[PDB]
Amino acid sequence: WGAYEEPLSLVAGFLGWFAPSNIKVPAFGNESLFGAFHASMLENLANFPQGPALTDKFWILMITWHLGLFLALTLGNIGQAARKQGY
Amino acid sequence: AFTPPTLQSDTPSPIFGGSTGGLLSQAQVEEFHVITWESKKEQIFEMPTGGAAIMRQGPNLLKLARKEQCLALLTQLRTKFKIDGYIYRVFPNGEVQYLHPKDGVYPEKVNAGRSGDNTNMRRIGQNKEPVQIKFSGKIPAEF
Amino acid sequence: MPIADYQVFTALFLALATGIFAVRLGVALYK
Amino acid sequence: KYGEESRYFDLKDLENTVGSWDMYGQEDKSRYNGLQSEFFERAANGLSRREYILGLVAIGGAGILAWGGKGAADVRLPTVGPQQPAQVGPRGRL
Amino acid sequence: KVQVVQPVNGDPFIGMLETPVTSSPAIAWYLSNLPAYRTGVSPLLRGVEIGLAHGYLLVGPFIKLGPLRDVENVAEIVGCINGAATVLILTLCLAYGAVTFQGEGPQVGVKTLSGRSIPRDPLQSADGWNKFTAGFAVGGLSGAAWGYLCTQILPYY
Amino acid sequence: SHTVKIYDTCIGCTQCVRACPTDVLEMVPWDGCKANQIASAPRTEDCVGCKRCESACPTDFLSVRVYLGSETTRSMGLAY
Amino acid sequence: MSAQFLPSILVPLVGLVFPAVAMASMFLYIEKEEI
Amino acid sequence: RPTWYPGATPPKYLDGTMLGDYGFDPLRLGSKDKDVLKYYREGELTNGRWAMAAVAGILFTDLVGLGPWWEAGAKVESSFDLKTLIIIEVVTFAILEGFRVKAYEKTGETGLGPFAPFDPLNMRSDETRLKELKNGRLAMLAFLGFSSQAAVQGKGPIECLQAHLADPGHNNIFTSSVGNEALAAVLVLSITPCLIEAKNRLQGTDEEEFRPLPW
Ligand code: CLA
């Protein structure tokens, strides 16, 4: 990157630009994980004014979506920098 | 006919990846020690500061903090690889002082020509009574 | 008849003098 | 240290063989604005002496005594406030 | 195949290691640009900056947690408390300077990671610490004073 | 800086010298024992006080004694 | 008690001013190099 | 050289080079650094000058029959609100003190504005300086006495003197509300020099390891 020595390569954007392509798939119930997360984000306040109360649907949706996104980001970075898992 | 061998600064150091148990700030303002030995092959040894290093084939130099660390490494080399080493004391100003093999002969072996320092010619119970040396900054063993 | 403020002030001043004597004795003992 | 190879000891460069490095220090005299720097060095003019800087600390000691004799009463501290009734005790005491 | 952990300045016999936390470019730049690591800047100015930051960040705790936090006059009481804390750490700095710098000795030189010789920080001297301590007092007291003003101003707060 | 002393009861077994972790003792010629050697402490400045030499002495009582005294940067075993 | 203001001044002096002064002086004296 | 009591032995550092040197400094406040001693003298002179001006004003207002000086703060009627007066005084005194600071940093003495020595009549000399120091010290004690008399007694500098002249044996400090405390001070001070002499006799004058107030 421009600063640091972060191994997060620019070509590795597929992590965060591909995880939504799979998290947007409907899961029968409700409409979709990302869809529900975005709807909650845009409805239960713009995650800045008041608050998501105590233990709301938005909390679990945000935690699950971020869990998947972070795991995909880190695992993909490891795999891409490992070059076909050469370690 | 023995003279203290001079310390060569061109001696390479053993292959080590680094550790947090090495020299600190005391070596910059007080002193540190250097142990130099000769190995017939490149082999893995245990360092007194933690971890494992690889001594090269030929001359090896290692800088440690205390003299006890150097002596422990020398003991390991003598009892494991049958390698003899030399220990020196280096000061920040740049003075090197020979140590351990003082007269080229190990202390456990009599050399006939050393100083018989601190050797009382009496028994342990033949020392002066503490009441007989009162008001004197000395213990009964120094009489 | 409770002790008045002037009595407390006098006692404090006498204590100050006593403390001065004490510090002098301590200095003499240090030597 | 002459660490061009595997030598980390050098009597002619003993300064580098003991790890005497600044690590993060950097000398640079171009940073603070001249007008603001002058104001601060001027404000802390004579306050650079041990006796004078201790005098500033002595002011804090006076403030401590001032609080007890005035500040504590102005903040309505419970110890400096009044007291309401009392109790008798276990038996016929006070 | 890359090894992000290396010995300090290539020397593997020094009690330190270079990790992406200590030798990181951004981390190194930010840490080197602090007023404490300015060998060429006057100790008084660096002390003023350090005191300003410390004094400003030291009001908050007493404001929201002091014994009189539930009273409208909490801001003033806390401003005074921070001033007292700054004066205390001020005498601490003076005592440290008077004890640490009281003698002279031919110390070893100082070089950079590359091997470029640099003079010792002027802050590590009898007069250097005194100037730094004086700046810390002015900055520390000013920071506490500014902490009270921010409470009165700052439309959001 | 501890005080290390050697007494004539020594038999010159050289065990104390081998047990010293800082090289403080050494064997010098003598004529009071069958081994014709006595122990000595020429480098007491490097003595740490571990008393390992006493744990190795076989004479009764001990022929080598260590009296702990003024502590220094070397006697305290400090590497910092 | 007579002079109720005295404790409010003596308690902080003996518990805050005197201890700080004594500790600072003791710290400066036990590390003088040449007393 | 006269001292602060007959036969007093001045400290070693109080040889007598400075003016008004009576060998008085039991706490040894200026026995370490000479620069600190110079600053102490400058502060003493400043306090003395302010004391002389204050004493002169207080006495003048009392002789013309004006009200009490301590109560005169609330008996002043004129324009300019209190806050305005405070601001004007703070600004003018800030500039005056800055000029005085520069004067002390240059010539080592006081001054008035840009004038470093400020002596239009050229009446500067070592003999005239001693007069200023002694007069300032006397004025400082005079102001201290004014405040003390206003607190203990309910009179002013002239009224207190008149009351004492009316009955010197019954109108003194030892007969006021602070007489007891005063009786404890004199009795101690009366034996202070003699006790010091004992120290100079049994112990001698070979200096001491420490100083009362180090600072
Ligand atoms: C760790 C335990 C602990 C904690 C959290 C507290 C907390 C508190 N005490 Mg308390 N106290 C304790 C132990 C503790 N006490 C003990 C053991 C005693 C008995 C000896 C007391 C006796 C006591 C008294 C008598 C009083 C208190 C009071 C208080 C309150 C105000 C004190 C204050 O503002 O200080 C100042 C706080 C600071 C100066 C902030 C320092 C901490 C900062 C936030 C550290 C931040 C580090 C930061 C994260 C670094 C990161 C790096 C950076 C780059 C980001 C406060 C909530 C007062 C009160 O009235 O209670 C309401 C009070 O009167 N305490």
Ligand code: CLA
């Ligand atoms: C050893 C005897 C002794 C002890 C244990 C105490 C204890 C106490 N006194 Mg007290 N006092 C004493 C003697 C003593 N006093 C004497 C003889 C006098 C007459 C002058 C006084 C006059 C006095 C007043 C006017 C007040 C106290 C107060 C107090 C309380 C708070 C302390 C304080 O800040 O006041 C300060 C105390 C003094 C200024 C004078 C004490 C001087 C003593 C004699 C020093 C003794 C030192 C000791 C022998 C050496 C031990 C070594 C040690 C210092 C490390 C405290 C419980 C305050 C109070 O009532 O709290 C509510 C208060 O206002 N005392």
